Amino acid sequence: MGPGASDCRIIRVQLGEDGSVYKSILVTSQDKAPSVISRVLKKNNRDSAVASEYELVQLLPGERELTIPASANVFYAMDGASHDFLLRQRR
Amino acid sequence: SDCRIIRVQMELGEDGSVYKSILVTSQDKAPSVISRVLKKNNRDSAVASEYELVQLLPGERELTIPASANVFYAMDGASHDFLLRQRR
Amino acid sequence: SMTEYKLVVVGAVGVGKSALTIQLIQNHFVDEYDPTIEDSYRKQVVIDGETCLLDILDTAGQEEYSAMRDQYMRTGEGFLCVFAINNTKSFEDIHHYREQIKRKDSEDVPMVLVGNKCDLPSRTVDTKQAQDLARSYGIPFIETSAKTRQGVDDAFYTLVREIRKHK
Amino acid sequence: SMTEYKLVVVGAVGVGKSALTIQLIQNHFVDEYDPTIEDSYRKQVVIDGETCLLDILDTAGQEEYSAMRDQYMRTGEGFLCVFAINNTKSFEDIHHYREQIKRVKDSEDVPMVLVGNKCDLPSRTVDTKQAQDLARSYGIPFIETSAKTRQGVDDAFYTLVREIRKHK
Ligand SMILES: Nc1nc2c(ncn2[C@@H]2O[C@H](COP(=O)(O)OP(=O)(O)NP(=O)(O)O)[C@@H](O)[C@H]2O)c(=O)[nH]1
Numbered sequence: 320m321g322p323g324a325s326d327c328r329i330i331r332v333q334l335g336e337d338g339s340v341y342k343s344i345l346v347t348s349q350d351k352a353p354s355v356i357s358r359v360l361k362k363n364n365r366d367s368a369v370a371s372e373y374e375l376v377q378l379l380p381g382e383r384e385l386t387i388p389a390s391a392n393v394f395y396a397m398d399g400a401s402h403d404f405l406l407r408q409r410r
Numbered sequence: 411s412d413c414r415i416i417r418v419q420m421e422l423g424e425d426g427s428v429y430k431s432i433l434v435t436s437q438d439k440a441p442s443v444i445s446r447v448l449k450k451n452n453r454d455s456a457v458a459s460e461y462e463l464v465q466l467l468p469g470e471r472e473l474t475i476p477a478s479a480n481v482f483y484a485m486d487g488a489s490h491d492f493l494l495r496q497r498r
Numbered sequence: 499s500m501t502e503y504k505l506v507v508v509g510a511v512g513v514g515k516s517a518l519t520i521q522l523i524q525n526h527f528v529d530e531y532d533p534t535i536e537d538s539y540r541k542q543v544v545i546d547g548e549t550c551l552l553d554i555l556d557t558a559g560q561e562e563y564s565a566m567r568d569q570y571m572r573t574g575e576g577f578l579c580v581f582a583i584n585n586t587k588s589f590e591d592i593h594h595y596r597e598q599i600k601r602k603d604s605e606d607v608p609m610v611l612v613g614n615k616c617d618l619p620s621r622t623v624d625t626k627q628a629q630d631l632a633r634s635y636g637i638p639f640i641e642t643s644a645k646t647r648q649g650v651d652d653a654f655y656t657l658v659r660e661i662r663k664h665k
Numbered sequence: 666s667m668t669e670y671k672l673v674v675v676g677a678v679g680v681g682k683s684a685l686t687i688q689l690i691q692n693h694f695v696d697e698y699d700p701t702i703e704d705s706y707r708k709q710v711v712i713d714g715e716t717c718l719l720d721i722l723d724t725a726g727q728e729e730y731s732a733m734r735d736q737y738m739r740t741g742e743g744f745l746c747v748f749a750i751n752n753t754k755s756f757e758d759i760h761h762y763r764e765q766i767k768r769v770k771d772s773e774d775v776p777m778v779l780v781g782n783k784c785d786l787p788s789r790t791v792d793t794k795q796a797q798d799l800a801r802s803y804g805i806p807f808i809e810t811s812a813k814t815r816q817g818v819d820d821a822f823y824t825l826v827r828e829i830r831k832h833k
């Protein structure tokens with residue numbers, strides 16, 4: 320008589336030699352931006368990242384993109400019509 | 411796409427375990443999940459076509475998941491607790 | 499009836515917490531790796547002549563499910579902190595686990611450190627630096643092995659001993 | 666316009682599919698355990714004088730994500746079937762993996778290479794004899810690798826490519 324809340328979502332996240340195109344990543348209803356950044360960054364073996372340097376931004380269809388606010392709940396922040404994100408820095 | 415974590419209890423003929431937490435995708439059908447929990451348990455020998463996955467709801471109410479259903483969309487959503495039993 | 503002890507096994511990914519929990523009950527070691535989210539077990543057994551039912555919680559190592567840490571740490575009585583002898587990273591991870599447990603609201607919580615891969619030849623952390631940590635935490639330290647079953651009983655029972663000690 | 670090859674790496678959890686792929690593409694091995702869901706890699710490289718773009722798919726070993734398997738097995742051109750020499754269970758799992766590859770896009774001749782992954786490890790739980798014997802019965806190649814020492818990594822991947830173009 321009504322859907323239950325979802326626990327997790329799978330997202331794909333894409334600086335540097337992009338040997339990998341993307342990595343599938345699990346994000347809980349509880350995750351803030353830093354959690355996700357360090358997660359993907361640790362997958363990428365880039366231990367030295369402070370996590371506060373990087374930014375996770377969603378790419379919507381029609382060549383339109385949006386940056387997810389840091390220290391915010393990515394599960395609720397994302398448009399939910401994408402699933403595809405990317406990580407970038409700031410020299 | 412979205413997923414849910416559910417806990418499922420076995421038929422538990424022997425002492426075994428209390429429950430095992432299991433992840434189910436928006437894509438999973440009942441057989442997928444039943445064989446999953448079956449392999450988690452020491453019933454590698456068991457066929458999944460035989461077993462039945464039953465959600466436990468408040469008020470001692472149960473719901474049996476149809477063999478063919480997508481559990482992610484089927485489940486009542488007032489419970490994350492299930493049980494696996496013979497259906498023999 | 500029976501004395502109830504609620505143990506919870508924590509540690510980094512792959513350290514072998516699942517393996518040794520499953521070794522405790524129905525005695526076996528399966529080399530198959532199967533990442534756990536949260537597995538609950540229950541077994542009755544006598545320790546130092548005391549019949550008691552163990553409520554063991556086999557927790558996840560993957561960050562993905564640390565969202566559940568505040569709940570399982572609340573409920574749990576005693577904590578088995580596991581690292582792998584081959585993974586130095588796991589050993590450093592224990593810091594984080596303990597401090598999260600400390601934040602039950604106590605500087606003393608019933609816990610026991612364990613190094614699970616005592617059978618592996620390629621030790622990256624010595625027992626010296628391990629028992630030295632345990633001394634600073636003021637908790638026991640047992641080198642276990644889920645494969646050979648060395649120390650599994652010892653390790654679990656010790657946490658029980660630590661629990662009854664704690665009151 | 667260059668030749669595109671779509672490789673897909675399958676195998677039990679922990680056999681070291683992710684590790685081998687990361688080795689071929691990024692020339693490094695980290696000991697870190699990190700369960701994978703679905704990792705996609707794209708790299709251009711010349712093989713036997715042929716410029717081609719490799720589309721490698723690093724799949725999950727956990728059933729949880731095998732809900733995707735019918736799609737990625739459809740799309741994939743060649744399949745790297747991996748077991749660990751220490752994990753006997755992985756070796757028995759190969760049977761199931763191959764049958765699944767056969768059943769999707771019904772064909773009994775599909776480009777595959779069997780791989781035994783942790784050959785640097787002392788344990789050795791499965792003989793290469795019984796592995797090469799399987800490969801002979803499957804009539805496919807068999808390479809023993811180590812993602813750690815990088816032994817066989819090049820050999821394994823490139824062989825699958827060779828097998829693919831052989832089946833135009
Ligand atoms: N040789 C050896 N292998 C071990 C030992 N403990 C665990 N392993 C192996 O290491 C792998 C990880 O085991 P497991 O218990 O699932 O690890 P975990 O700590 O539960 N991982 P997770 O955080 O995902 O739950 C398995 O293949 C297991 O057989 C040990 O003492 N010796």
Ligand SMILES: Nc1nc2c(ncn2[C@@H]2O[C@H](COP(=O)(O)OP(=O)(O)NP(=O)(O)O)[C@@H](O)[C@H]2O)c(=O)[nH]1
Pocket residue numbers: 676677678679680681682683684685695696697698699700701702724725726727782783784785786810811812813
């Ligand atoms: N010594 C050694 N370790 C290896 C080798 N290949 C992988 N490993 C190690 O074994 C573990 C599993 O590797 P990984 O690539 O994540 O395995 P996987 O097959 O991708 N597992 P999953 O299905 O979850 O993605 C890691 O600790 C990795 O470093 C190898 O050839 N030699």
Ligand SMILES: [Mg+2]
Pocket residue numbers: 515516517532533534
């Ligand atoms: Mg586990």
Ligand SMILES: [Mg+2]
Pocket residue numbers: 682683684699700701
């Ligand atoms: Mg992996």
